[PDB]
PDB file of C-alpha atoms and ligand atoms in Angstrom:
ATOM      1  CA  UNK A   1     -15.021  -4.864  39.326  1.00 33.71           C
ATOM      2  CA  UNK A   2     -18.235  -6.836  39.356  1.00 33.74           C
ATOM      3  CA  UNK A   3     -20.967  -5.307  37.193  1.00 31.10           C
ATOM      4  CA  UNK A   4     -19.352  -1.936  37.846  1.00 29.04           C
ATOM      5  CA  UNK A   5     -16.389   0.096  36.688  1.00 30.03           C
ATOM      6  CA  UNK A   6     -14.797   3.335  37.864  1.00 29.45           C
ATOM      7  CA  UNK A   7     -13.759   5.738  35.095  1.00 29.72           C
ATOM      8  CA  UNK A   8     -11.800   9.005  35.096  1.00 30.03           C
ATOM      9  CA  UNK A   9     -11.798  11.845  32.557  1.00 28.93           C
ATOM     10  CA  UNK A  10      -8.791  14.141  32.985  1.00 28.74           C
ATOM     11  CA  UNK A  11      -7.661  17.693  32.004  1.00 30.25           C
ATOM     12  CA  UNK A  12      -6.111  16.391  28.803  1.00 31.84           C
ATOM     13  CA  UNK A  13      -9.456  15.125  27.380  1.00 28.99           C
ATOM     14  CA  UNK A  14      -8.693  11.499  28.173  1.00 32.17           C
ATOM     15  CA  UNK A  15     -10.717   8.667  29.706  1.00 33.41           C
ATOM     16  CA  UNK A  16      -8.636   6.048  31.548  1.00 34.42           C
ATOM     17  CA  UNK A  17     -10.222   3.179  29.647  1.00 34.21           C
ATOM     18  CA  UNK A  18     -11.152   2.609  26.023  1.00 36.05           C
ATOM     19  CA  UNK A  19     -12.767  -0.756  26.566  1.00 37.15           C
ATOM     20  CA  UNK A  20     -15.462  -1.893  28.956  1.00 39.68           C
ATOM     21  CA  UNK A  21     -16.582  -5.491  29.336  1.00 41.19           C
ATOM     22  CA  UNK A  22     -20.058  -6.119  30.728  1.00 39.74           C
ATOM     23  CA  UNK A  23     -20.533  -9.622  32.131  1.00 42.40           C
ATOM     24  CA  UNK A  24     -23.664 -11.101  30.652  1.00 39.96           C
ATOM     25  CA  UNK A  25     -24.645 -12.509  34.039  1.00 41.76           C
ATOM     26  CA  UNK A  26     -24.982  -8.909  35.322  1.00 40.13           C
ATOM     27  CA  UNK A  27     -28.576  -7.728  35.662  1.00 40.98           C
ATOM     28  CA  UNK A  28     -27.408  -4.141  35.522  1.00 38.76           C
ATOM     29  CA  UNK A  29     -24.145  -2.324  35.069  1.00 38.01           C
ATOM     30  CA  UNK A  30     -22.781   0.764  36.777  1.00 41.14           C
ATOM     31  CA  UNK A  31     -20.237   3.385  35.691  1.00 43.88           C
ATOM     32  CA  UNK A  32     -18.757   5.767  38.236  1.00 42.71           C
ATOM     33  CA  UNK A  33     -17.194   8.783  36.588  1.00 42.98           C
ATOM     34  CA  UNK A  34     -14.743  11.191  38.194  1.00 44.20           C
ATOM     35  CA  UNK A  35     -12.613  14.062  36.937  1.00 41.13           C
ATOM     36  CA  UNK A  36      -9.036  14.420  38.120  1.00 43.79           C
ATOM     37  CA  UNK A  37      -7.386  17.764  37.426  1.00 42.31           C
ATOM     38  CA  UNK A  38      -8.433  21.308  38.091  1.00 38.99           C
ATOM     39  CA  UNK A  39     -10.417  22.568  35.071  1.00 37.51           C
ATOM     40  CA  UNK A  40     -14.107  23.373  35.270  1.00 35.38           C
ATOM     41  CA  UNK A  41     -17.152  22.033  33.386  1.00 38.20           C
ATOM     42  CA  UNK A  42     -17.423  24.805  30.753  1.00 39.77           C
ATOM     43  CA  UNK A  43     -13.855  24.205  29.714  1.00 41.26           C
ATOM     44  CA  UNK A  44     -13.181  20.528  30.248  1.00 39.64           C
ATOM     45  CA  UNK A  45     -16.510  18.972  31.030  1.00 40.46           C
ATOM     46  CA  UNK A  46     -16.929  15.220  30.764  1.00 41.20           C
ATOM     47  CA  UNK A  47     -19.863  12.837  30.651  1.00 40.82           C
ATOM     48  CA  UNK A  48     -20.130   9.145  29.959  1.00 39.67           C
ATOM     49  CA  UNK A  49     -22.666   8.369  27.309  1.00 39.07           C
ATOM     50  CA  UNK A  50     -23.619   4.971  25.851  1.00 41.72           C
ATOM     51  CA  UNK A  51     -25.242   4.245  22.511  1.00 43.27           C
ATOM     52  CA  UNK A  52     -24.909   1.765  19.687  1.00 42.79           C
ATOM     53  CA  UNK A  53     -21.913   2.551  17.524  1.00 42.57           C
ATOM     54  CA  UNK A  54     -24.320   3.278  14.691  1.00 43.78           C
ATOM     55  CA  UNK A  55     -26.075   5.916  16.768  1.00 41.66           C
ATOM     56  CA  UNK A  56     -22.969   7.587  18.240  1.00 40.85           C
ATOM     57  CA  UNK A  57     -22.573  10.370  15.666  1.00 41.82           C
ATOM     58  CA  UNK A  58     -26.199  11.407  15.866  1.00 42.28           C
ATOM     59  CA  UNK A  59     -25.983  11.627  19.624  1.00 44.53           C
ATOM     60  CA  UNK A  60     -22.751  13.626  19.510  1.00 40.33           C
ATOM     61  CA  UNK A  61     -24.154  16.032  16.898  1.00 38.90           C
ATOM     62  CA  UNK A  62     -27.487  16.574  18.639  1.00 40.13           C
ATOM     63  CA  UNK A  63     -25.677  16.902  21.981  1.00 39.28           C
ATOM     64  CA  UNK A  64     -23.471  19.750  20.738  1.00 37.88           C
ATOM     65  CA  UNK A  65     -26.562  21.559  19.535  1.00 38.66           C
ATOM     66  CA  UNK A  66     -28.220  21.090  22.939  1.00 34.43           C
ATOM     67  CA  UNK A  67     -25.866  23.505  24.686  1.00 34.31           C
ATOM     68  CA  UNK A  68     -23.917  23.659  27.908  1.00 34.30           C
ATOM     69  CA  UNK A  69     -27.094  24.124  29.998  1.00 37.98           C
ATOM     70  CA  UNK A  70     -28.228  20.700  28.744  1.00 39.32           C
ATOM     71  CA  UNK A  71     -24.835  19.132  29.406  1.00 37.73           C
ATOM     72  CA  UNK A  72     -24.329  18.925  25.641  1.00 37.38           C
ATOM     73  CA  UNK A  73     -26.794  16.025  25.434  1.00 36.60           C
ATOM     74  CA  UNK A  74     -30.209  16.097  23.681  1.00 37.06           C
ATOM     75  CA  UNK A  75     -32.877  15.547  26.320  1.00 36.19           C
ATOM     76  CA  UNK A  76     -34.805  12.248  26.081  1.00 37.34           C
ATOM     77  CA  UNK A  77     -32.639  11.096  23.127  1.00 36.68           C
ATOM     78  CA  UNK A  78     -34.024   7.584  22.479  1.00 37.86           C
ATOM     79  CA  UNK A  79     -30.591   6.518  21.213  1.00 36.53           C
ATOM     80  CA  UNK A  80     -28.822   7.100  24.549  1.00 36.75           C
ATOM     81  CA  UNK A  81     -28.856   3.815  26.448  1.00 37.05           C
ATOM     82  CA  UNK A  82     -27.404   5.340  29.596  1.00 36.01           C
ATOM     83  CA  UNK A  83     -25.530   8.499  30.561  1.00 35.11           C
ATOM     84  CA  UNK A  84     -24.063  10.517  33.382  1.00 37.61           C
ATOM     85  CA  UNK A  85     -24.281  14.263  33.720  1.00 36.35           C
ATOM     86  CA  UNK A  86     -21.484  16.535  32.527  1.00 33.90           C
ATOM     87  CA  UNK A  87     -18.872  17.129  35.266  1.00 31.55           C
ATOM     88  CA  UNK A  88     -15.918  19.350  35.882  1.00 33.74           C
ATOM     89  CA  UNK A  89     -12.806  18.662  37.972  1.00 32.50           C
ATOM     90  CA  UNK A  90     -13.348  17.424  41.494  1.00 31.69           C
ATOM     91  CA  UNK A  91     -16.910  16.300  40.716  1.00 28.51           C
ATOM     92  CA  UNK A  92     -18.500  12.829  40.539  1.00 26.77           C
ATOM     93  CA  UNK A  93     -21.434  11.243  38.767  1.00 25.05           C
ATOM     94  CA  UNK A  94     -22.559   7.696  38.169  1.00 22.13           C
ATOM     95  CA  UNK A  95     -25.078   5.773  36.136  1.00 21.54           C
ATOM     96  CA  UNK A  96     -26.650   2.328  36.545  1.00 22.16           C
ATOM     97  CA  UNK A  97     -28.453   0.732  33.647  1.00 23.04           C
ATOM     98  CA  UNK A  98     -30.199  -2.518  32.860  1.00 21.43           C
ATOM     99  CA  UNK A  99     -28.119  -4.959  30.967  1.00 21.29           C
ATOM    100  CA  UNK A 100     -31.257  -6.237  29.175  1.00 19.64           C
ATOM    101  CA  UNK A 101     -30.974  -3.008  27.114  1.00 17.80           C
ATOM    102  CA  UNK A 102     -27.925  -4.563  25.462  1.00 14.39           C
ATOM    103  CA  UNK A 103     -27.828  -7.393  22.978  1.00 11.99           C
ATOM    104  CA  UNK A 104     -25.189  -9.667  21.495  1.00 14.20           C
ATOM    105  CA  UNK A 105     -24.015  -8.939  17.957  1.00 13.32           C
ATOM    106  CA  UNK A 106     -24.374  -5.209  18.503  1.00 16.13           C
ATOM    107  CA  UNK A 107     -21.406  -2.817  18.713  1.00 13.94           C
ATOM    108  CA  UNK A 108     -21.729  -0.294  21.548  1.00 14.23           C
ATOM    109  CA  UNK A 109     -19.688   2.832  22.039  1.00 15.93           C
ATOM    110  CA  UNK A 110     -19.203   5.017  25.092  1.00 15.14           C
ATOM    111  CA  UNK A 111     -18.088   8.592  24.655  1.00 15.96           C
ATOM    112  CA  UNK A 112     -18.145  12.132  25.985  1.00 15.90           C
ATOM    113  CA  UNK A 113     -20.415  14.629  24.161  1.00 15.87           C
ATOM    114  CA  UNK A 114     -18.619  17.777  25.218  1.00 13.09           C
ATOM    115  CA  UNK A 115     -17.765  19.735  22.030  1.00 11.61           C
ATOM    116  CA  UNK A 116     -14.899  18.137  20.185  1.00 11.95           C
ATOM    117  CA  UNK A 117     -14.125  15.676  23.007  1.00 10.54           C
ATOM    118  CA  UNK A 118     -15.475  12.507  21.369  1.00 11.39           C
ATOM    119  CA  UNK A 119     -12.659  12.348  18.847  1.00 13.19           C
ATOM    120  CA  UNK A 120     -10.484  11.404  21.812  1.00 13.80           C
ATOM    121  CA  UNK A 121     -12.884  10.407  24.569  1.00 12.36           C
ATOM    122  CA  UNK A 122     -14.442   7.235  23.313  1.00 12.12           C
ATOM    123  CA  UNK A 123     -14.300   3.508  23.626  1.00 13.93           C
ATOM    124  CA  UNK A 124     -16.053   0.224  23.110  1.00 16.41           C
ATOM    125  CA  UNK A 125     -18.546  -1.458  25.421  1.00 13.39           C
ATOM    126  CA  UNK A 126     -19.111  -5.125  24.966  1.00 10.39           C
ATOM    127  CA  UNK A 127     -21.408  -7.697  26.500  1.00 10.96           C
ATOM    128  CA  UNK A 128     -19.726 -11.042  27.126  1.00 15.57           C
TER     129      UNK A 128
HETATM  130 HG1  LIG B   1     -15.176  15.357  27.730  1.00 13.64          HG
HETATM  131 HG1  LIG B   2     -18.272   7.017  16.715  1.00 12.05          HG
END
């Protein structure tokens, strides 16, 4: 939709998109995350985390080490452009971020930092 997208993470460790386009005219962009299924956060938690592609691995690694009580995301990580909280089934979280934090000629990735999820739960985010 305009300057916004709705995203689902399911019980099979899947997002329902692997590619997000952000319209350059947008002043900010919003992601609304939900979690179909019936499994809880500790088992099948999802978040939506944005970083440059170059920074993704560092964020994933430091997030795992941060623990479940930190939503598997390092607090105040300067590499995380925007993020939701970790959610289980039946829950919702959203994030709005300034589009000025993105540039052209930079590859962005979105992913989930729950342990082992990012191998499957990841995609591209592009400003155009
Ligand atoms: Hg996940
Ligand atoms: Hg990556």
